[PDB]
Amino acid sequence: MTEYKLVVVGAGGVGKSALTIQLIQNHFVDEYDPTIEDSYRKQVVIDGETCLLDILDTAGEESAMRDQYMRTGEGFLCVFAINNTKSFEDIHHYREQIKRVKDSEDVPMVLVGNKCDLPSRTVDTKQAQDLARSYGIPFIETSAKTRQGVDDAFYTLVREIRKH
């Protein structure tokens, strides 16, 4: 079946691991080693197409797998936490890294505002929508805890990859 190679990036603590594990096995993880970087594969059906999502959950330092995923990844989830202003301000660094390593101005990407269940929002929805518009990319609000938007985030990224 078709495989889509996806990479999850963003500041420490924004919920990259929790979003990945919620997608993979439908559970919310309260604590996941901030240094563990692993890849996961899930069969899904997106717009009728049975396919494999091949996901690297990046973490942190100098690996062969991470280098290969950055170079050959087909699409990137750029994650910030809606209660962490710095993580949102850091988003442009991750986008720039992707453009540099891919040597391309046109890389499939989705902006993800995670932790939307929390009572501590400091990044307005419109603020992130405005950023995504300037980048020309989709924006999806998610919660790895409630599952809001989790499938939508990954599936939207697949649909962006398909356009490439």
Ligand X SMILES: Nc1nc2c(ncn2[C@@H]2O[C@H](COP(=O)(O)OP(=O)(O)O)[C@@H](O)[C@H]2O)c(=O)[nH]1
d(CA 42, CA 34): 22
Residues 6+ apart with CB under 8 A from 72: 5
Q: Residue 145 Cβ, how far from Mg ion at the closest point, in Å? A: 15
User: Has 32 been labeled as part of a binding site?
Assistant: yes
Largest CA distance in the chain: 41
- Asked whether the beta carbons of 18 and 29 are under 8 A apart, the reply is yes
* Under rule CB under 5 A, residue 101 binds Mg ion: no
CA distance readout (Å), 37 to 33, 64, 96, 157 = 9, 12, 21, 20
* Under rule CB under 6 A, residue 17 binds ligand X: yes
User: Has 12 been labeled as part of a binding site?
Assistant: yes
Select the residue interacting with ligand X from 37, 54, 90, 117 (CB under 6 A): 117
Q: Please say which residue, 14 or 56, places its beta carbon nearer to ligand X.
A: 14
Sheet containing 49-57: order of strands:
38-46, 49-57, 2-10, 75-81, 109-114, 139-141
Q: What is the three-class DSSP state of 9?
A: strand
* Under rule CB under 6 A, residue 61 binds ligand X: no
- What residues from 10 to 69 belong to the interface with Mg ion (CB under 5 A)? 16-17, 59
d(CA 71, CA 62): 15
- What residues from 25 to 54 belong to the interface with ligand X (CB under 6 A)? 29-32, 34
Q: Please say which residue, 143 or 156, places its beta carbon nearer to ligand X.
A: 143
Q: Please say which residue, 143 or 160, places its beta carbon nearer to Mg ion.
A: 143
Q: Which among 112, 164, 107 is positioned nearest to 142, based on CA atoms?
A: 112
Q: Please say which residue, 108 or 143, places its beta carbon nearer to ligand X.
A: 143
Select the residue interacting with ligand X from 15, 113, 138, 149 (CB under 6 A): 15
Residues at the binding site for GTP are 10-18, 29-35, 59-60, 114-117
Residues that bind ligand X (CB under 6 A): 10, 12-18, 29-32, 34, 114-115, 117-118, 143-145
